[PDB]
Amino acid sequence: SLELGAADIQDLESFEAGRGALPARAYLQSDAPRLSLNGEWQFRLSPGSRVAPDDGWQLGEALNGFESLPVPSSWPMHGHGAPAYTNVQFPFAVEPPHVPEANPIGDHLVVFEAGPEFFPHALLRFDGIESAGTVWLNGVELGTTRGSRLAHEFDVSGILEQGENTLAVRVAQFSAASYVEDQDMWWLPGIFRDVTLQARPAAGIDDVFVHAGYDHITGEGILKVEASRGGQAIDAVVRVPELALELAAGTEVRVPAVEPWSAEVPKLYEAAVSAAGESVALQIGFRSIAIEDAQFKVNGRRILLRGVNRHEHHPRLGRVVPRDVVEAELRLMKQHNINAIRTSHYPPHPQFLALADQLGFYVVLECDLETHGFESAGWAQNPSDDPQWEDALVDRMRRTVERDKNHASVVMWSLGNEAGTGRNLAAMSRWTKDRDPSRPIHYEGDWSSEHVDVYSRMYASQAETALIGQGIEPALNDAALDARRRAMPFVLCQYVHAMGNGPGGMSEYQALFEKYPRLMGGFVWEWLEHGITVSTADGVDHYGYGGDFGEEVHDGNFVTDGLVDADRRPRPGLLDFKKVIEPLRIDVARDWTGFTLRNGQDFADTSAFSFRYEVEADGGALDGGTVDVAPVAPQSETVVELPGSVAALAAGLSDGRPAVLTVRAVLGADSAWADAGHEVAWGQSVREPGAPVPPAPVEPVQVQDSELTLGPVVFSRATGMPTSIGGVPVEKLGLTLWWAPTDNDLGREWGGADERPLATQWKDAGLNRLHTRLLGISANPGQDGGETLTVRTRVSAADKQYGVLVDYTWSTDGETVGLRTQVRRDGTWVNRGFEVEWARIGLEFVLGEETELVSWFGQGPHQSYPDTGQGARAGWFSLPLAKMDVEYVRPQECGARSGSRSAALQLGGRTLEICGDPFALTVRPYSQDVLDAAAHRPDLKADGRTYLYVDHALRGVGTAACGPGVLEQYRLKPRDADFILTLKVRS
Amino acid sequence: SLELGAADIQDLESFEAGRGALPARAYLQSDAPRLSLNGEWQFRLSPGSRVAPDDGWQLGEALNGFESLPVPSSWPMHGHGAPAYTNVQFPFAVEPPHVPEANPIGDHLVVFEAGPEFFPHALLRFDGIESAGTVWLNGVELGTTRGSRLAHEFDVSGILEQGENTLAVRVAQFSAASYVEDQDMWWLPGIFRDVTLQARPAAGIDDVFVHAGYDHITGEGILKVEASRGGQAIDAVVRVPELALELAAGTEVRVPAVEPWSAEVPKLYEAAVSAAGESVALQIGFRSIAIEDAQFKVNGRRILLRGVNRHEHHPRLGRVVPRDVVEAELRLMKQHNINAIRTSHYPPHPQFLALADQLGFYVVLECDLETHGFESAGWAQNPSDDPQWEDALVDRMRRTVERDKNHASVVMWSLGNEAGTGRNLAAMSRWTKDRDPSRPIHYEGDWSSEHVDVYSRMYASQAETALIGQGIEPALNDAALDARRRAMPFVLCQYVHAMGNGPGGMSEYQALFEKYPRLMGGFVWEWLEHGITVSTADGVDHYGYGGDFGEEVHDGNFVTDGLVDADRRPRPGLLDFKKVIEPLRIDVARDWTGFTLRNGQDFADTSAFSFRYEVEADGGALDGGTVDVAPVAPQSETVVELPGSVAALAAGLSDGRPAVLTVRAVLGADSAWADAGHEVAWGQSVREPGAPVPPAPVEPVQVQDSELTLGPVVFSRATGMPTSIGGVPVEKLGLTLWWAPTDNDLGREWGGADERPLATQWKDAGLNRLHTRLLGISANPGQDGGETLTVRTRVSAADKQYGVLVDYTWSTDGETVGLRTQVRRDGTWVNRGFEVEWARIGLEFVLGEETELVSWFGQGPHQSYPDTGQGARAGWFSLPLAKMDVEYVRPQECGARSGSRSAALQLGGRTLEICGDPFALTVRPYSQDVLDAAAHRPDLKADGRTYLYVDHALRGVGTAACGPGVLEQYRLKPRDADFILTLKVRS
Ligand SMILES: OC[C@H]1O[C@@H](O)[C@H](O)[C@@H](O)[C@H]1O
Ligand SMILES: OC[C@H]1O[C@@H](O)[C@H](O)[C@@H](O)[C@H]1O
Ligand SMILES: OC[C@H]1O[C@@H](O)[C@H](O)[C@@H](O)[C@H]1O
Ligand SMILES: OC[C@H]1O[C@@H](O)[C@H](O)[C@@H](O)[C@H]1O
Ligand code: NA
Ligand code: NA
Ligand code: NA
Ligand code: NA
Ligand code: NA
Ligand code: NA
Ligand code: NA
Ligand code: NA
Ligand code: NA
Ligand code: NA
């Protein structure tokens, strides 16, 4: 046997869970001496095991080819190799347990000093290594690590020396473990979490298991704190000063009156567990979880999960998320009404749990297991059902549970994600149920739900969710399993996929969640986009995605699919989600005399809120103030009278004059996660402006050689289009039926014989390449000598027989311009045997000047489409042109403001005003073809023009990239239509 | 009605065949004064009718914005606008008869002088205007033209002035006529054929209709020459000096003994038809066409059509083909055994016919009609069935027939191409049959063949052609139509689509054509690639295709689909076609004592040929000479003894020594189309070399730290691959299963539930991204202390479970290296539910040095794949590296030499020799990924390496871009395989 590297590769191809580590235990804050070894290490990268040197480097002499690297790190984020993104597909041939030849091997080394406090006994702790580590201390092999987001500890007693020590870690990117770590995220090798030296004093505490239940009938806590050393129960004293408790470890007691823990009221009691040589600090939250009557209950009450799936990602540091970023993003979640987190799809940093305990989230804590890439071969060779993987998979679940078992915020254990079905998942479940019966088990991969306590699905349609909510879903074939599952509460562990413009359809899910007790709620996919910061030539920063790093196989921008960008800037979808899940419902009376208030919280009353009202009209705020609301109990509702001045305004206002009454619930005092005045919920009553009044057509049409003039409008006799309106240059006016496809429009709509993405249906139909033919121009009798001008056109596409006849009828009294647009189908809009859907029925004005400011009356300030925009409230808004856009990583249709009644564009010295029955408003400095063609934001370029879109109809955006497409009521099928606009130019 | 251009557009949207022209007539050479107005004209381009100026330009004063342009021209070939390519799809919305707003309008003007010989009567002739012309002379509108490849004449009597005249022509690119001119070719507006002034003397001859039949029983000609003036029969004298004839026009006579016209013997008699004021010169070919017993017969004999479809294209002049290019390309056709031409899909230049008469081609003369783009809407609005188009379509057929009716070479009239079915096609057929019953009618669009005389199909499979050949195809539903069609002879008006690497499957068609009398033969699609010369930045010329000129809709390189490139350089497919259709069959005896000779001609014996033999061995030609063959009658065969020295050589040669006997039929004397010695047919008998002798494995394996040495081979212990062989640096050695897709591999294979193109099946399966894992390296006992080296690998692709185990076993005696390769499937090669086919089973050697020369024993000199290479004969060949490639416009797999037994690559100072059982040999200066990625030839770049491909198996190339894919016997399904090679390096 003559090839090199055979021994290294045999270890990497091992089915075992690594070797030499201490037993799995909790992460515990203790008074034992601790030394962080984080800092600047030395690093050397080789392309595979067979050429990785065996040159004595572990002794830190002859450091040929090492350079400085921070640890913790995801090494490709610091110029060593490159990040690589795949969703489902493995980036290596699928032949477990074998590894590819191209397998980055990273050799890490650090020299440190240990004082006498680390003797005689100490350990080394590694909180994460992707994917396989071998650890040496002073040349002595301690062992190996498997389970990339799991902790490993190694005893260094007798190996650690007083004074200088040399720690060496060889890390392989790929190993047999990669076959069970196929999460949809970047592949990023490294020592990416803390490395810590911990003294282990005699008579200490190795592990602690807190049991802190709550009896909602009596108000009592039920407390038992187990403590062990070396795997044996030990005498320790547990002290809980706030509850006046001093008790022995290992004894169960009843605490007469505790305040229970929930995400809404995350009450924690400080406790210490003390042995003669070591003391552990704990935060204890008393809460009990029960499944009863097909409901998921905490402390005796059904809860509603308002969740997100949280990955660990940083755009410049990879899997290393700095603590201040964690703290800020959790506050941002609370500020957007989120109360639940799924740790997709692996345990988080160990210090994450205390923050979730403190700030208050219901946490689904998920084991590091996903074998999704085996699905394409019908799950042949799936690790989850292969006996050779049993010890490895049970070890993952054991380490997951042991680390985090003391945290009140963890309300469910999850076995993993998209790992199919099989005997090893059943083993993991059995192990967990035996070890910790206090928490229900979650796993979506096995729909029969045989080895779980809740029924979990991902992206089940609103329709199917409604059936499950009513308990009337189709039965399993096994009647015993059906009876069990039909009696389980139901959770969407992932739903309303938040990629790009979207997600649509959130309100239809939320109405079900709030109506049906069996529906626990849902976790959006996902919290964050995994953008990675890159720069073009000339150094414009932007986010990159799959394929931007030279990957042979990748999944493009499917990793940029979140509610916030990688720097935690909200996408519009987060603003809408906040409103959809708001925990108070405020229904303002149409006569402005009061509002109905529903408290949708599970435990807290409304005493934390201040209730504010404001009345706004075109001239500004007319009135505002606070109203005193007696605290409303959870799940209750009341009517609140508004002060009489508000109704008096409603009475006085002229008919047709717009006015907006807004009632808001804000924090009355600072919380841990937001300041006093932070808005939690709102409701509105709107007095809509009257429909626009088209002008009297008293101005005649003036005929020149090549132009026509009608009041302030000049028209080309060659095209029938205006060339200027009140001095504003017009380069083009035409009908629009299409938009630059969203990420959702690039997804297939499963169901229906046509499974082309909508973007492809549009391209096949020519909707992205429409052309206009002029049929005629004629003047007609107006009023008092005036005339109207009718321009008749037909819109179609090359090689197609279907079209729409579009008639524009222009009128003017010299100041206001009336524009009537009439659209009539000419031939059936069917292509390749399927009906052609439209994006919109609208007009595109291309103006020959740049727009500085856009103002409108409608919804805002952010974008809104028919099935989104919940967070866009009624009002008057004004934005610089640049802020009308949405900085999605792949540019796509975005920025429409649906429900507009009036708009004003400032174009230098003139203002173009537009009024209509509800229309969508979009304004861009580049064309739709530039938007569509652009793959990254630097591809967008302003051309000195204004592209103004006025839509009479729009389709929704749905979630077709993953899950339901646009629901029927928001789809736009071809139809005939007519609509009126008025236009005015002020100088 | 206020829009501009309404009158111009109404004329362009007219269904009528234009106006003001003289009656259609023949193109006739006459002694009447003629003046060509070709030369430098003045030209002005406008973007559409509505802005085209009406500024008096037709009077040639105030020439604001005109510049010089040659006429004839296709104006986009001279920098005015751009060529645009579509295949089927129309480049404008389909709403006949309406035209798009973007419609290039070209205003042409020339001033010329007319002498007194053009008075009192003269006409102006236009032999082609694409697509709509309006003609003025001295400001007087003469009329308009429709039918872009048809002639129009206008009477200028009373309008032409003695002295200076001003001719003005406004030409619109698009008109209602564009809907009936949807040929797959470039859209190219212009005045693209001759413009001629012709005097019309009193007592002249306006039209002539030659009727020249042949009675094959008596050998007599049957002659009647009709002559008219002003639509009335006239007294004229017909003189045919060579036949001693002086006869009256309008009288039918029997000529006692003529020599009949055929493509093989294109006998023409010079004749003159004379009235008092004008004389016409004619070339008369006596031939009669008959359909009898389901056979297409000329002069009493069934013929075999060896055809091509000929478009008119020039890479720099567009639809203008210079006469010297026409003459040369026709000679090139004859030089490649072609005897028939279809004028796809419009009449050719009027002077083309005399050349076809003279050089000898059977011509299918096709009317300018194609409505293919209506098929996508189920032929809704198809002009061919719309009564409004009847006069326009009958006018096209009338002008087609009248122009060319006197030419012996025209043996069938065709109504058009891909125009569906309908009443107007039936009218065209009825008109033609009434006017000229001497020629059968062709039209493939109506398979029922109700209004035609032959059954025509395009790209019918070899299988279906065999059924039709035997008269056993499925019946039509109408038994009367079935009886008629089953009694028709059958022609493939298009077959073996010649796009890119290919066409495969030609031999299977040819065997049928020669076996079954009902099969008339076939016309390849097509003669030429319509490449257009363009240049990159830095000025490297290359051909462009669809999309290279900014087209919104286009069909890419589907216009580069010919046997020759646009400059008439042969593609390999033409060299193979020449051999497939060779009109003599030479079958050399295996004992080299003689050959069987079949004369496959229809009329001529073999007396025109000299029969040559040559014997070649490794050292060169051993013997050669001529053999006297008594002339063999058409459709007969004989055995010819070879001189005894040839057999004596066969006897003397050592067993296993390679030797090639070639017998060739060459022209014994110059012809009109080639020189004496031009090769027409050949046959060979080959004494194959013995299989290679692997060396005795007497050399041991030497083990170094990171390398192994086995005789002259050095191996990496990290990869198992050789790093040098006899000092030749080796960068990579690995298995190949894939090739850079051909144009055919990009086509769908209709039939079978999998209609992905093969290229897509390969991409989905990862065949374009294979990776290799090393399993082990070990030495084994050899002979006399020597050892063999076995390297075990596995080849697969990321995210796939299927692989192939590949074992390489190396041996050496210090000079020769033996390489045994064993391939074993590991898992089923099925992806997406369908079996994955392979391109090949071979090896890729990447050498670290450039190759100057490639020599081999096998077939050549050009490329050969399993279902091609008919023209590649056995022999020894040697080419510079650059000449191994094939300059297809879109680079793709090409250049393999199948059937190789030995190869030698000169790499500077060393020669690498390879021997094997038959293998395919390819050598390139760039990798397969560069080849695949390249869209035009300048994308290819040499990287300083040599890419050497040795294939044990290859698949065929088929014709899947249009018509049959690879036939079953040439497909390469996954299998297990083993093969031996020997390698030697000479310095
Ligand atoms: O973004 C697509 C998503 O699809 C789900 O099936 C998966 O569980 C998620 O991890 C993510 O990949
Ligand atoms: O102010 C009410 C709060 O209720 C919590 O349960 C939630 O996590 C917060 O996001 C906020 O909605
Ligand atoms: O190259 C594809 C070919 O397809 C045929 O159907 C057509 O008759 C030809 O003109 C050419 O378009
Ligand atoms: O030399 C025989 C010749 O026969 C003709 O019919 C044919 O057009 C030529 O290409 C050549 O084959
Ligand atoms: Na619920
Ligand atoms: Na994703
Ligand atoms: Na209050
Ligand atoms: Na809204
Ligand atoms: Na885009
Ligand atoms: Na035949
Ligand atoms: Na073509
Ligand atoms: Na002879
Ligand atoms: Na051959
Ligand atoms: Na290519």
Numbering used by the authors:
A (entry chain A), B (entry chain A): 24 to 1010
Quoted from the paper:
Psychrophilic β-d-galactosidase from Arthrobacter sp.
The question of the effect of point mutation of the other catalytic residue, E517, has not been answered before. The ArthβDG_E517Q exhibited no catalytic activity, whereas activity of mutant ArthβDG_D207A was severely depleted. In the case of ArthβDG_E517Q, only a slight change in character of the active site was observed —similar to previously studied loss of function mutant ArthβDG_E441Q.
